[PDB]
C-alpha cells in the first residue's frame, strides 16, 4: 500500500493555498472510507436511505460524501453500461465459437435498453440464441449444483441473461441472490423474457464473483461455467475496473522483477533483443599513491563507464573526467545517480530502433536508478546478471586503458570488442571468445601476453584493438588461456586445477561464486 | 469425428490451441510459428513465422573455407502449402 | 554453438530452445480473445479503449491517428530486424 | 479446404516464394482452386538473379512453395465459410 504516495506527492512539493492543503490532507480519508466501504455501505449499518448511483449498479444505502465521491470516480466515463455490454458480447462470442456442436441455430442479442442493464426493478434477456431443435428445458437450478434433473419440458428458443451487482459485506452471497433474482424474473411483472427457460447470470463486481442459477440447458452448463471462469479471469472491462479500483485505493502489488541470468540463461542474451552489459564498477579512479613523506598523493584519475553488446559485438566507452568527480560537493550516491543519468542519456543518444531491449547491469544497486532515470523509456528491461563478466579488462588495455587515463573529455567513441569474430565467428562463439580473452587478461600479465600475441609478428589489426586471430590461432590461444585460468582457480581454491564440469567451468569463467 | 484422431490431427494438436510448432520443408528451411488455419492438403496458414535455415558465404575468401551460419528471417503472415512441406513437430 | 544442420529439424529447435525462442459429454474447447481486425491482439488497456470507443460511437482524432501510425511504423521497423562505421572510424 | 480462402484474396498485395527460390511479390487479382495465381504489376526475383518487374504474371500452384501476406490481411474473417 502506497503510504501517502497515491499522487505524485499530493502537490506537497508546491506552494498551494490553505484550501488545497486541507483537501490534500482530507484525501486519505476518502481512501480509508473506500477501503472499508463494504463494511460501511451495508443497509444494516446506516438507516434506510437507499440511493442508486446514476447509470451504475452501486446502490449506496446512505450518504457518505467521501465514499460517494470515490465510487463515482471509480465508475468514471460511463463504466457500468460499457462493462455490461462487454460481458454480454464476450459471452456471445464464447458461445458462438463452438455453438454449432452445442445444437445452436442462430444467436442474436435482443433489443435491450441501456437502462435495462442497471435497473433491478425491470430486467430483460441478454442472449436470444435459437437451438434448431426441441431443446428439453431443464429444471432451473444453480450452476453450482451437480444434480442432473430435467423436468418434462421442451422448447426451441433458449435465453440467457447476465446481471451486474455490487455486493456488500452481507450481500456477497452470489448464488442465493442470483437464484432469488431468477425466480423473481420468472414471474416478473415487467421483465418479459421471450423464453420461459431463460437462465440469468450475476456478477458480484464488488466481491469479484459470478454465478448463474437459471435453466441450465442440456450440455450448456459446463459451457456457461467455462465462459464465466474465463471472463472472470480476463474480462476486459472487468480488468479495467479492477485496475481503476486498485489505483483508487492506493494499492499496487509488487510487480515481478527481471530474473537473473544463471549458467542456463548465459547464452539467452545473444538473441535479437539488444543487450548492453553495463558494468561501471571501475568508474571510480584515484592515485591512492603513497608519497615519499608527509602525505599520499590524493589525485583522482579520469574514470569511465563500460557499455558493450555481446549480442552485436559492439563496444562503446564513455569516459568520466576526474574534474567532474572532484570538487562537486556531493557524496557517492550523487555520483552514482549522475552515472545512471549519463547511461540513460547515452541510451537516448542511441536511436530508438537501436535501443537495447535489455540492460544487464553488473552493479546490484544500479538497477533502480537506471529505471528511475529513464522511466520515460521503458522498452528496456533491466535484467540481472549475477555472474559478473570481466569487462574491466578494457581499463587495463594498452590503448583503451591509456585513453581512459587521459580522456579528460566525455567521449562517446565506439569500438569493436571482438577482434575479428563479428564477421568471422558465431555471435555466441564471439561472446565466448571475448570472455576467454578477458579472463586471460585478468588472470595475469605474462600469461595474457602469451595468449594475446603468441607470435611477435602476430598483432591486432591497425584499425582494431583486440588481437586478431584465425580459428587455429584462436583455438591455441584459448587452450593456453583455459590452462592459465584452471591454474589460477586451483591456486585460489587450493584444489585440483581441472576438476570442474563444462557447465561449472562456464559458470566459473562467467563469474559465478562456485 | 475422425478429424481429431488422424496423423493430420497431430498437426491439428500442434495448432490445437494456437500452439507453436516448427515445420521443416523440402528446401531445408525450418519455419516456426503458431498455425492459424489448416486444411486437408496440409495448407498451413500461420502468423509471425520465424524461418531459420543454414546459410553459407559460398567461398568468400576464394578457397571455399567457410562455416555455415543460422540465417533467420521473420514473416508477418505466411501460407505454406502442403506440397513442399516435409515434416512438422510441435514444441515441447 | 549448435549450427543449423541440413535436412534436420531437431537442430533448429535446439537452437531456438537455447536462444530462448520457445448433456452430450465433453470438455469445452473455448478460448476467446479480443484481437483487432488487423490481427494484432489488442492489449487489455487497448481492448478497453476499443470497447469504450464502440460504446461512445466515436473514434480516434487526427493527432491520435498520427501517433498510432507512427507507433505502428516504429514497431514494424523494430520487428523487421553501426558496428562497421565504428570499426572504420577507429 | 484452404483454396477457397486463397481464391477470395483478390486485389491484395502479397508475395509467393516458389520451389526454385524465385519470389514474386505483387497484387494478386485471380486465384482458382488449383492456386493459379494471376497477378498484375508484380516483381519476381529469382535465385541468384536480378529482380524483374512485369505488368502481368500467372504463377502456378504446383511450383509455389510458400506465401507471404502482410499484417493488413484479415485472416480471421477470410478463413470462414
Amino acid at each position: 500500500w502506497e503510504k501517502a504516495s497515491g499522487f505524485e506527492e499530493s502537490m506537497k512539493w508546491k506552494k498551494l493555498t490553505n484550501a488545497q492543503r486541507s483537501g490534500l490532507n482530507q484525501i486519505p480519508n476518502r481512501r480509508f472510507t473506500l477501503w472499508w466501504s463494504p463494511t460501511i455501505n451495508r443497509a444494516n449499518v446506516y438507516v434506510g436511505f437507499q440511493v442508486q448511483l446514476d447509470l451504475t449498479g452501486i446502490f449506496m444505502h446512505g450518504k457518505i460524501p467521501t465514499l460517494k465521491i470515490s465510487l463515482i470516480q471509480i465508475f468514471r466515463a460511463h463504466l457500468w453500461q460499457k462493462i455490461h455490454e462487454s460481458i454480454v458480447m464476450d459471452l456471445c462470442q464464447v458461445f458462438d465459437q463452438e455453438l454449432d456442436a452445442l445444437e445452436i441455430e442462430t444467436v442474436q442479442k435482443e433489443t435491450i435498453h441501456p437502462r435495462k442493464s442497471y435497473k433491478m426493478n425491470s430486467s430483460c434477456a441478454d442472449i436470444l440464441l435459437f437451438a434448431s431443435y426441441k431443446w428439453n428445458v431443464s429444471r432451473p437450478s444453480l450452476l453450482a449444483d451437480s444434480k442432473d434433473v430435467m423436468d418434462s419440458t421442451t422448447t426451441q428458443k433458449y435465453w440467457i441473461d447476465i446481471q451486474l451487482r455490487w455486493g456488500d459485506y452481507d450481500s456477497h452471497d452470489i448464488e442465493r441472490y442470483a437464484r432469488a433474482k431468477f425466480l423473481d424474473y420468472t414471474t416478473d411483472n415487467m421483465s418479459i423474457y421471450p423464453s420461459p427457460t431463460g437462465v440469468l447470470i450475476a456478477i458480484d463486481l464488488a466481491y469479484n464473483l459470478h454465478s448463474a442459477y437459471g435453466n441450465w440447458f442440456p450440455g450448456s452448463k459446463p459451457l456457461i461455467q467455462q465462459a464465466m471462469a474465463k471472463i472472470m479471469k480476463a474480462n476486459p472491462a472487468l480488468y479495467v475496473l479492477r485496475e481503476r479500483i486498485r489505483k483508487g485505493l492506493q494499492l499496487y502489488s509488487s510487480e515481478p522483477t527481471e530474473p537473473y541470468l544463471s549458467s542456463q540463461n548465459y547464452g539467452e542474451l545473444f538473441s535479437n533483443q539488444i543487450i548492453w552489459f553495463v558494468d561501471d564498477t571501475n568508474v571510480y579512479r584515484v592515485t591512492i599513491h603513497k608519497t615519499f613523506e608527509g602525505n599520499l598523493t590524493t589525485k583522482p584519475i579520469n574514470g569511465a563507464i563500460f557499455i558493450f553488446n555481446p549480442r552485436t559485438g559492439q563496444l562503446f566507452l564513455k569516459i568520466i573526467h576526474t574534474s567532474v568527480w572532484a570538487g562537486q560537493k556531493r557524496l557517492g550516491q550523487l555520483a552514482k545517480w549522475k552515472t545512471a543519468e549519463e547511461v540513460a542519456a547515452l541510451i537516448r543518444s542511441l536511436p530508438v530502433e537501436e535501443q537495447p531491449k535489455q540492460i544487464i547491469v553488473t552493479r546490484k544497486g544500479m538497477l533502480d536508478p537506471l529505471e528511475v532515470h529513464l522511466l520515460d523509456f521503458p522498452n528496456i528491461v533491466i535484467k540481472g546478471s549475477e555472474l559478473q563478466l570481466p569487462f574491466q579488462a578494457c581499463l587495463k588495455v594498452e590503448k583503451f586503458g591509456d585513453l581512459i587515463l587521459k580522456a579528460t573529455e566525455p567521449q562517446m567513441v565506439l569500438f569493436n570488442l571482438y577482434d575479428d569474430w563479428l564477421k568471422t565467428i558465431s555471435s555466441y562463439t564471439a561472446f565466448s571468445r571475448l570472455i576467454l580473452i578477458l579472463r586471460a587478461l585478468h588472470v595475469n600479465n605474462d600469461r595474457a601476453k602469451v595468449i594475446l600475441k603468441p607470435d611477435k609478428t602476430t598483432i591486432t589489426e591497425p584499425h582494431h584493438i583486440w588481437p586478431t586471430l584465425t580459428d587455429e590461432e584462436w583455438i591455441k590461444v584459448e587452450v593456453q588461456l583455459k590452462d592459465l585460468i584452471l591454474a589460477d582457480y586451483g591456486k585460489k581454491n587450493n584444489v585440483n586445477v581441472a576438476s570442474l564440469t563444462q557447465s561449472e567451468i562456464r559458470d566459473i569463467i562467467l563469474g559465478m561464486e562456485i | 469425428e475422425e478429424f481429431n484422431t488422424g496423423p493430420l490431427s497431430v498437426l491439428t494438436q500442434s495448432v490445437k490451441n494456437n500452439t507453436q510448432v516448427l515445420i521443416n520443408c523440402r528446401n531445408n528451411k525450418k519455419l516456426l510459428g503458431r498455425v492459424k488455419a489448416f486444411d486437408r492438403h496440409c495448407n498451413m496458414v500461420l502468423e509471425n513465422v520465424k524461418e531459420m535455415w543454414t546459410e553459407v558465404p559460398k567461398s568468400g575468401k576464394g578457397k571455399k573455407k567457410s562455416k555455415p551460419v543460422n540465417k533467420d528471417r521473420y514473416i508477418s503472415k505466411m501460407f505454406l502449402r502442403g506440397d513442399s512441406v516435409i515434416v512438422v513437430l510441435r514444441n515441447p | 554453438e549448435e549450427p543449423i544442420v541440413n535436412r534436420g529439424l531437431a537442430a533448429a529447435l535446439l537452437l531456438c530452445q537455447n536462444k530462448g525462442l520457445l448433456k452430450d459429454g465433453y470438455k469445452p474447447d473455448v478460448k476467446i480473445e479480443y484481437v483487432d481486425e488487423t490481427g494484432r491482439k489488442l492489449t487489455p488497456k487497448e481492448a478497453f479503449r476499443q470497447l469504450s470507443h464502440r460504446f461512445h460511437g466515436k473514434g480516434s482524432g487526427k493527432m491520435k491517428t498520427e501517433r498510432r501510425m507512427k507507433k505502428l511504423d516504429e514497431e514494424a521497423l523494430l520487428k523487421k530486424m553501426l558496428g562497421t562505421v565504428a570499426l572504420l572510424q577507429e | 479446404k484452404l483454396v477457397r480462402f486463397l481464391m477470395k484474396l483478390s486485389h491484395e498485395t502479397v508475395t509467393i516464394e516458389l520451389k526454385n527460390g524465385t519470389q514474386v511479390h505483387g497484387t494478386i487479382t485471380g486465384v482458382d482452386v488449383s492456386m493459379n495465381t494471376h497477378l498484375k504489376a508484380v516483381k519476381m526475383t529469382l535465385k541468384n538473379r536480378e529482380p524483374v518487374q512485369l505488368e502481368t504474371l500467372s504463377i502456378r500452384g504446383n511450383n509455389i512453395r510458400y506465401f507471404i501476406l502482410p499484417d493488413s490481411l484479415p485472416l480471421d474473417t477470410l478463413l470462414v465459410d
Binding site: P114 | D39 | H56, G57 | -
Partner: peptide, 26 residues
C-alpha cells in the same frame, strides 16, 4: 485436416452518441 481457425470482428453495439431511439437496435 490439422487445425484451422478464424475470428469474427466483435463489433460492440453502439451505446453513447447513438442519436437514435432509447432501446438498443438489432
Amino acid at each position: 485436416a490439422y487445425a484451422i481457425n478464424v475470428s469474427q470482428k466483435r463489433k460492440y453495439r453502439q451505446y453513447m452518441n447513438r442519436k437514435g431511439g432509447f432501446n438498443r437496435p438489432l
